[PDB]
Amino acid sequence: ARSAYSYIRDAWENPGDGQLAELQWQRQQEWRNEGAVERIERPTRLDKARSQGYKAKQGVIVARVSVRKGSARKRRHKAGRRSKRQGVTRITRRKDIQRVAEERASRTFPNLRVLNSYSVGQDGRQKWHEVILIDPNHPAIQNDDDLSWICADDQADRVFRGLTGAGRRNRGLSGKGKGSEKTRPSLRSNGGKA
Amino acid sequence: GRRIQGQRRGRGTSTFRAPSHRYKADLEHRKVEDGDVIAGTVVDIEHDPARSAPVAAVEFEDGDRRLILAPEGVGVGDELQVGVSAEIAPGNTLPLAEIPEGVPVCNVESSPGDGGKFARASGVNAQLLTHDRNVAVVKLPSGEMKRLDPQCRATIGVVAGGGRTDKPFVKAGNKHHKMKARGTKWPNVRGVAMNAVDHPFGGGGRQHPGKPKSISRNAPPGRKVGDIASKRTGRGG
Amino acid sequence: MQMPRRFNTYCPHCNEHQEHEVEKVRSGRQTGMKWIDRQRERNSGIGNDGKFSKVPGGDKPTKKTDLKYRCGECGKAHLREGWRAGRLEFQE
Amino acid sequence: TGAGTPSQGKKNTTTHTKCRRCGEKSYHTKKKVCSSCGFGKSAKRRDYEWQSKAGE
RNA sequence: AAACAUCUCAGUAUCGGGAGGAACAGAAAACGCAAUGUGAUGUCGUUAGUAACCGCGAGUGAACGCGAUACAGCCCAAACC
RNA sequence: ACUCGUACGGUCACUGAAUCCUGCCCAGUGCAGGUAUCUGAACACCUCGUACAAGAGGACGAAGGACCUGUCAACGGCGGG
RNA sequence: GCUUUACUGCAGGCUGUCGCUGAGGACUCUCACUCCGGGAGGAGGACACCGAUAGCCGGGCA
Ligand SMILES: [Cl-]
Ligand SMILES: [Cl-]
Ligand SMILES: [Cl-]
Ligand SMILES: [Cl-]
Ligand SMILES: [K+]
Ligand SMILES: [Mg+2]
Ligand SMILES: [Mg+2]
Ligand SMILES: [Mg+2]
Ligand SMILES: [Mg+2]
Ligand SMILES: [Mg+2]
Ligand SMILES: [Mg+2]
Ligand SMILES: [Mg+2]
Ligand SMILES: [Mg+2]
Ligand SMILES: [Mg+2]
Ligand SMILES: [Mg+2]
Ligand SMILES: [Mg+2]
Ligand SMILES: [Mg+2]
Ligand SMILES: [Mg+2]
Ligand SMILES: [Mg+2]
Ligand SMILES: [Mg+2]
Ligand SMILES: [Mg+2]
Ligand SMILES: [Mg+2]
Ligand SMILES: [Mg+2]
Ligand code: NA
Ligand code: NA
Ligand code: NA
Ligand code: NA
Ligand code: NA
Ligand code: NA
Ligand code: NA
Ligand code: NA
Ligand SMILES: [Sr+2]
Ligand SMILES: [Sr+2]
Ligand SMILES: [Sr+2]
Ligand SMILES: [Sr+2]
Ligand SMILES: [Sr+2]
Ligand SMILES: [Sr+2]
Ligand SMILES: [Sr+2]
Ligand SMILES: [Sr+2]
Ligand SMILES: [Sr+2]
Ligand SMILES: [Sr+2]
Ligand SMILES: [Sr+2]
Ligand SMILES: [Sr+2]
Ligand SMILES: [Sr+2]
Ligand SMILES: [Sr+2]
Ligand SMILES: [Sr+2]
Ligand SMILES: [Sr+2]
């Protein structure tokens, strides 16, 4: 039969309809009054969290992060530039907001490592994402067959190097064939043209 | 070119800042729960550096000692009241609703409880004209009819120091001393007297703006100089 | 100059002389779906857009005849070199 | 008053001093920032790729 | 580009953040020598200055495949408990 | 920042103590106001086109402009016959 | 370097539109949101602010 989880999932396919709509309208009032990074005892979207690797266990942390909506916040050129490099208003950044969110969360918890993250909505001026972080130093995790991998040294600060799922997508690594000529194995090795 | 003086101002550097560390106090009305059971005695009259007008130190019943925006005619010993039931006499504060029409007032709040925003300068006053259950109509010093919430508090009488403007500075040195007590860069160099690089009016053999002075409201900073969005100019017509 | 609306001349289609009707070539409306239209959208962005920032050239003092020659029997038209003419009015 | 020799006589202010962190006489005692190693400004050590030729 | 604005120089210089002894990538919602065919991923040689881009100017410029190197394939979420 | 400031304020400009004065010009340019009618983009809407889409046309029309008015201690002008 | 009714652009301001954004060609309301208030509460209100986009102005700047 259907899992109870599928109902949370199904609710979130249309965050603007049904009960979920009223919940968001209510919640966001409280969220707008919270900080940039707020640790939370439980995921707002359980199905998604468990699906991304979450577990109700010691060493597993979840934090909601908010970021200002819109494009880049850039300063106009102070020195000479050709029309092409004078743009200021319509220029957007190369990292999506979810990625910016994952990084802020990881800075707040220097000892934890980003596992994954997901969207929990937005209003007209900001977006919220919840991030799952793991304590690579806690034995409950060092002994977990499904998560101990994140304890390896080369997984340190993984988010800052784009090793996250959101990181990999944003780097154009989804496709294994056509279109990934300049993304795989890295944007850098391909001269930064992807 | 280079940023014009109006643009240097905004950075709020020392040259353009007000000597705040030398200012005395923020003359906002007292906050009373209700009842008007708040009265104090004028303990002294002081000089207010930020306004070139006198201010009065008051000792209230509950022990609070604070400076107040003094109207003309207030002296030491006198007793002042602040509240809904305050008496209708010079130097007393109460909501416009309690003030009888046709009474000159000063230090009028814009939004009930803000402490006073209007008519605070030397010898000026707002004129309470119309009352109502929903809107109190006041005539501000500029002659503008302002609709205010009857719950907006004010002080009866006119501000002390009137006539200050009637005497000429006579000397540059006198202007100088006053200017040193304000957030203002002085003296003033005319735009037409500067180099083209420093102002829209700079440059040219003889001095003269090389353009009409009436500038559009939409002009960007750096260009909005001269006569801003003038509806007209001159004295004629 | 004057020009006869219809006259006998060679029709490269029938391959024989037949009566033709002469008409001024009317401009055909664009579709906005040609490759050039797509390149304009693709290559125009922030700042100067190269060739897509240029504007309409000038005009020669006189233009050449721009006519269609329609065969009166097979109904097909053919084109010819034009010649400079200040004005071109047809007779009948 | 000339900007040269006569204006050099007024110079008796102490600014740059031996830095506690790197040992260079670059710790600005007024800013409390070392212009050589960055002490007082950053935990990380002051460094720049332009301190050497690009390909070296 | 014998000017110059798209283009070029170049994702170069330089800047911010971060890991390791190497990084990154990686077990197909691939490829599309179209097939009765190949079978994770780097890299090297080639494919090729080819396809593609471009005031269609100056210039920019892959991939599939093939020959090599080395080879390795697995774990969750959910269903049922 | 101005600002512990509030029109007897302070911002932006011009002239440059006192004294006697400061004429005519609103066509152009600038600023500002108004505007029946005209013109005026995108989204949504309607027609055609496409089993869809590109696209073509339409209707509506903001600021702006046309047009009208105010204004020279606003740019400036005050000739030839 | 400087100028402007040189060319081409870029900030910025005005303006429409879409999202924030809710209930019953003009309107009421309150619940988001904004502001005032120490607080209770008051004012305002689906506007404004902010994101996106479109038109106009645009030597302030390149
Ligand atoms: Cl991390
Ligand atoms: Cl003054
Ligand atoms: Cl013709
Ligand atoms: Cl193959
Ligand atoms: K260039
Ligand atoms: Mg298992
Ligand atoms: Mg590599
Ligand atoms: Mg005060
Ligand atoms: Mg000063
Ligand atoms: Mg002056
Ligand atoms: Mg000079
Ligand atoms: Mg000079
Ligand atoms: Mg200038
Ligand atoms: Mg002059
Ligand atoms: Mg050249
Ligand atoms: Mg390029
Ligand atoms: Mg050429
Ligand atoms: Mg290239
Ligand atoms: Mg291929
Ligand atoms: Mg003068
Ligand atoms: Mg002089
Ligand atoms: Mg506030
Ligand atoms: Mg220039
Ligand atoms: Na971390
Ligand atoms: Na790309
Ligand atoms: Na393109
Ligand atoms: Na050259
Ligand atoms: Na040159
Ligand atoms: Na090009
Ligand atoms: Na082969
Ligand atoms: Na005129
Ligand atoms: Sr670290
Ligand atoms: Sr105040
Ligand atoms: Sr206050
Ligand atoms: Sr001048
Ligand atoms: Sr006059
Ligand atoms: Sr493009
Ligand atoms: Sr452009
Ligand atoms: Sr010509
Ligand atoms: Sr000197
Ligand atoms: Sr000397
Ligand atoms: Sr000295
Ligand atoms: Sr510091
Ligand atoms: Sr460095
Ligand atoms: Sr293999
Ligand atoms: Sr005089
Ligand atoms: Sr005029």
Short mmCIF file of all heavy atoms in Angstrom, two decimals, chain D residues 49-56, chain E residues 13-14:
data_model
loop_
_atom_site.label_atom_id
_atom_site.label_comp_id
_atom_site.label_asym_id
_atom_site.label_seq_id
_atom_site.Cartn_x
_atom_site.Cartn_y
_atom_site.Cartn_z
N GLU D 49 49.44 36.33 -5.44
CA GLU D 49 50.10 35.74 -6.60
C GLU D 49 50.92 36.77 -7.38
O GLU D 49 51.84 36.41 -8.11
CB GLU D 49 49.08 35.07 -7.54
CG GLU D 49 48.44 33.79 -6.99
CD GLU D 49 49.45 32.74 -6.54
OE1 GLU D 49 50.02 32.02 -7.40
OE2 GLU D 49 49.70 32.64 -5.32
N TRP D 50 50.61 38.06 -7.21
CA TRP D 50 51.36 39.09 -7.91
C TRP D 50 52.72 39.37 -7.29
O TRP D 50 53.47 40.20 -7.79
CB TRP D 50 50.57 40.40 -8.04
CG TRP D 50 49.86 40.88 -6.78
CD1 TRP D 50 48.53 40.77 -6.49
CD2 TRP D 50 50.45 41.60 -5.69
NE1 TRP D 50 48.26 41.38 -5.30
CE2 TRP D 50 49.41 41.90 -4.78
CE3 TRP D 50 51.75 42.02 -5.39
CZ2 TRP D 50 49.63 42.60 -3.58
CZ3 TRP D 50 51.98 42.72 -4.21
CH2 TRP D 50 50.92 43.00 -3.32
N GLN D 51 53.04 38.67 -6.20
CA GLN D 51 54.35 38.86 -5.55
C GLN D 51 55.44 38.15 -6.34
O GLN D 51 56.61 38.18 -5.98
CB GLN D 51 54.32 38.31 -4.12
CG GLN D 51 53.44 39.11 -3.19
CD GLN D 51 53.39 38.51 -1.79
OE1 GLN D 51 53.09 37.33 -1.63
NE2 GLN D 51 53.69 39.34 -0.78
N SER D 52 55.03 37.50 -7.42
CA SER D 52 55.97 36.80 -8.29
C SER D 52 55.47 36.89 -9.73
O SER D 52 54.32 37.27 -9.98
CB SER D 52 56.07 35.32 -7.89
OG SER D 52 54.89 34.62 -8.27
N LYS D 53 56.33 36.52 -10.67
CA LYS D 53 55.93 36.54 -12.07
C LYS D 53 54.80 35.53 -12.23
O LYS D 53 54.78 34.51 -11.55
CB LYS D 53 57.12 36.18 -12.96
CG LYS D 53 58.12 37.33 -13.13
CD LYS D 53 57.45 38.50 -13.84
CE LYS D 53 58.35 39.71 -13.91
NZ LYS D 53 57.58 40.87 -14.40
N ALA D 54 53.87 35.82 -13.12
CA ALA D 54 52.73 34.96 -13.35
C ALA D 54 53.03 33.48 -13.52
O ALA D 54 52.43 32.65 -12.84
CB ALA D 54 51.95 35.46 -14.55
N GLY D 55 53.96 33.13 -14.40
CA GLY D 55 54.24 31.72 -14.62
C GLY D 55 55.30 31.14 -13.71
O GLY D 55 55.94 30.14 -14.04
N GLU D 56 55.46 31.73 -12.54
CA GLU D 56 56.49 31.27 -11.62
C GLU D 56 56.10 31.59 -10.18
O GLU D 56 54.96 32.09 -9.97
CB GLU D 56 57.79 31.96 -11.99
CG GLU D 56 58.97 31.61 -11.17
CD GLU D 56 60.16 32.46 -11.52
OE1 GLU D 56 60.03 33.70 -11.46
OE2 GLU D 56 61.22 31.89 -11.86
P A E 13 46.12 32.39 -15.36
OP1 A E 13 47.37 31.64 -15.11
OP2 A E 13 44.87 32.02 -14.67
"O5'" A E 13 46.36 33.94 -15.08
"C5'" A E 13 47.52 34.62 -15.61
"C4'" A E 13 47.53 36.06 -15.16
"O4'" A E 13 46.46 36.80 -15.81
"C3'" A E 13 47.27 36.27 -13.67
"O3'" A E 13 48.47 36.04 -12.94
"C2'" A E 13 46.80 37.73 -13.64
"O2'" A E 13 47.88 38.64 -13.74
"C1'" A E 13 45.99 37.82 -14.94
N9 A E 13 44.54 37.68 -14.81
C8 A E 13 43.77 36.57 -15.04
N7 A E 13 42.48 36.77 -14.89
C5 A E 13 42.40 38.11 -14.52
C6 A E 13 41.31 38.94 -14.24
N6 A E 13 40.03 38.55 -14.27
N1 A E 13 41.58 40.23 -13.91
C2 A E 13 42.85 40.62 -13.87
N3 A E 13 43.96 39.94 -14.11
C4 A E 13 43.66 38.67 -14.45
P U E 14 48.41 35.40 -11.47
OP1 U E 14 49.79 35.51 -10.93
OP2 U E 14 47.74 34.08 -11.49
"O5'" U E 14 47.43 36.39 -10.68
"C5'" U E 14 47.86 37.70 -10.27
"C4'" U E 14 46.67 38.52 -9.82
"O4'" U E 14 45.76 38.72 -10.94
"C3'" U E 14 45.77 37.90 -8.76
"O3'" U E 14 46.28 37.98 -7.44
"C2'" U E 14 44.47 38.66 -8.96
"O2'" U E 14 44.51 39.99 -8.48
"C1'" U E 14 44.41 38.71 -10.48
N1 U E 14 43.73 37.51 -11.01
C2 U E 14 42.35 37.49 -10.98
O2 U E 14 41.68 38.41 -10.55
N3 U E 14 41.78 36.34 -11.47
C4 U E 14 42.43 35.23 -11.98
O4 U E 14 41.77 34.27 -12.39
C5 U E 14 43.85 35.33 -11.98
C6 U E 14 44.44 36.43 -11.51
#
